[PDB]
């Protein structure tokens, strides 16, 4: 009924500040990676660390019928590679893996929703591999990859 | 930029009569599998052939907000593992594969949409495993995987 995953150990997260897409995403329940109503169905654009550790996000989110940007803070913990939202609800943010060049991996709170980012809107085999191999043991009854073109674009098309 | 799957010689339509439910499902493009909006994303639940081999399908569908029942005729073509819908849009239907007993995978149409069928709301790793195999050369950017309570409900929960 168990389940566990390789995380982050000295993740100094000044390193993955700038510019990021989601280029991947999976979760363990279809609706969470639902289109319209699910509000993990979120496109990243920017990572902004703040001098003591807290970080900025730049994400597009499906909303009235539109794509929309919004600006949301996540507060650092105990744990440097977890982090904290309470915006409608409480969500712990979790990176698992990063070479803060190429990918950054993260998961979101029974039901999880994982992230694959890269920093430029093409494919990347190593980072979609490494995505792959993170979460083989969750069990993830969705999963979405984006092509370039809806990497630049208004929530992935 | 070309792909080929495997498909149906020898299909005895006739043996595919019954009661269904779709367990997985997989598109090449994100948005055909869409919850609210996309008419692939349908739930099989009993196959009628007919005695000249056409296919009445009952299937469910998210429409007007709420799971709703359609009942829709397929009619056979010169290939026997292909027939044809004129509902809204053109739709062609490919069967790729099937035991009659247990699996039965099959195709709908440069955006492809595929389901993998069983006779009962279990899962079944066989019939999941012919259908990665099967899909695996076409590039499936989206795939969805259904659990047993979800296959006894209004349009998997
Ligand atoms: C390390 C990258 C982390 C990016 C995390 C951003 C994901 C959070 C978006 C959803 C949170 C708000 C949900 C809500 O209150 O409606
Ligand atoms: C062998 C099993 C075949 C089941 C095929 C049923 C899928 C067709 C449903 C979508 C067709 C109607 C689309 C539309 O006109 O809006």
């Known amino acids: 009924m168990l389940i566990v995953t390789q995380t982050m150990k000295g993740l100094d997260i000044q ?92 998961c979101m709170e029974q039901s999880l929703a994982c992230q694959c980012l890269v920093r430029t809107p093409e494919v990347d085999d190593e980072a979609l591999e490494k995505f792959d191999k993170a979460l083989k043991a969750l069990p993830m009854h969705i999963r979405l990859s984006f092509n370039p073109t809806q990497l630049e674009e208004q929530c992935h098309i």
């Not at 329940?29 to 996000?57: C, H, N």
């Open 15 to 106: 390193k993955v500040a700038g510019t990021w897409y989601s280029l991947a995403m999976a979760a363990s329940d279809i609706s969470l990676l639902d289109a319209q109503s699910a509000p993990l169905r979120v496109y990243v654009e920017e990572l902004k660390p703040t001098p003591e550790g807290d970080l900025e996000i730049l994400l597009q989110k499906w909303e009235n019928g539109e794509c929309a940007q919004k600006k949301i803070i996540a507060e650092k913990t105990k744990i440097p590679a977890v982090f904290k939202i309470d915006a409608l609800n409480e969500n712990k943010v979790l990176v698992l893996d990063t070479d803060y060049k190429k990918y950054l991996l993260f």
